[PDB]
């Protein structure tokens, strides 16, 4: 209130207001929701393998 000019530790810039704060990162990656094939018992399996 009584101090419009302050000492913000991790705010850079000539008149503060730069937000150079560190980023807290805990090794989290959100990728996608997995899917599993079901057409195994819903078809007939023939293995041409290494012949034709």
């Amino acid at each position: 209130d009584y101090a419009g000019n302050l000492t913000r530790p991790h705010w850079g810039g000539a008149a503060s207001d730069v937000d150079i704060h560190l980023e807290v990162y805990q090794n989290e990656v959100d990728t996608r929701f997995q899917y599993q094939a079901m057409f195994l018992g819903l078809s007939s399996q023939r293995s041409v393998a290494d012949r034709s």
């Binding site: 991790h10 990656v29 996608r32 899917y35």
Partner: protein, 274 residues
């Protein structure tokens, strides 16, 4: 002023035939970060008038402050959930992260006082079912899902001919009409009395509820992978003497911020009257 979470996109399947090359495909990624910017506060001074007024009135004020802070906490979480229904996922990570979900339902509100009061419950159930359909299309697991409903939506739901009926399978699902709706569409429901009004919210200028956001009276989200709350100052209370103003001042201040990880895991229903 920052908590960061990374994001990752998928691959794409191609096809070669006999002697053509295998064209490499990039995989894109990005990060997400929540920042804390606003501290809530309650200030309560007493102008040394406790000398004359024997009652302290200081143990009830603490309970009131705790109740108000819990209220604001729940309301801020709900506001974040319902304001993320318009979030658009970036194209460079689109195939994995989808958009937000908004489902429209027409409710006659109190204007219906007949057998048409059963038409509101059917619409509510249909909207929730459509949200679940969207979630299942996104392959989101539903083991941790939860549904929150405003009180009026709960009551309108209670008058449903097909959901509180023992014929349709109420062996363990919705076994009584006496205000115990528990699960519908396969996931639990909780009657929440903290859905925001049309006004503003103390947590920031990005929180103020629009006219349309006040219509949203139902959410459906995973308890473990939808909302993340970032804490800077835990809720603390303090009383300190003020010599200069000749008063004793009671403070209660907390600092946090709520963000959505996987905004595509929440279904929000907007009830646009009739």
């Amino acid at each position: 002023n920052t908590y960061r979470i990374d994001r990752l996109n998928t691959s794409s399947v191609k096809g070669r035939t006999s002697g053509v090359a295998l064209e490499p495909t990039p995989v894109r990624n990005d990060k997400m970060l929540i920042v804390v910017d606003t501290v809530l506060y309650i200030r309560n001074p007493i102008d040394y008038q406790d000398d004359w007024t024997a009652p302290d009135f200081l143990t009830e004020m603490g309970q009131n402050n705790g109740s108000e802070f819990a209220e604001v906490f729940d309301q801020a979480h709900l506001i974040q959930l319902i304001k993320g229904r318009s979030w658009v996922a970036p194209a460079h990570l689109k195939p994995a992260f989808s958009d937000g979900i908004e489902i429209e339902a027409t409710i006659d509100s109190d204007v219906t006082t007949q057998a048409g009061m059963e038409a509101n419950a059917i619409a509510i159930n249909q909207a929730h079912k459509a949200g679940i359909d969207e979630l299942i299309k996104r392959k989101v697991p539903l083991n941790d899902m939860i549904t929150l409903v405003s009180t009026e939506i709960y009551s309108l739901l209670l008058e449903h001919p097909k959901l509180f009926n023992k014929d349709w399978g109420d062996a363990n699902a919705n076994g009584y009409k006496e205000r115990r709706a528990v699960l519908m569409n396969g996931i639990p429901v909780v009657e929440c009395t903290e859905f925001p009004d049309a006004g503003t919210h103390p947590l920031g200028s990005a929180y103020t509820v629009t006219a349309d956001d006040a219509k949203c009276r139902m959410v459906t989200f995973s308890k473990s992978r939808t909302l993340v709350t970032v804490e800077a100052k835990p809720f603390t209370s303090r009383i300190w003497d003020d010599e200069q103003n000749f008063a004793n001042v009671l403070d209660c201040y907390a600092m946090y911020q709520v963000g959505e990880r996987r905004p595509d895991t929440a279904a929000v229903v907007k009830f646009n009257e009739a």
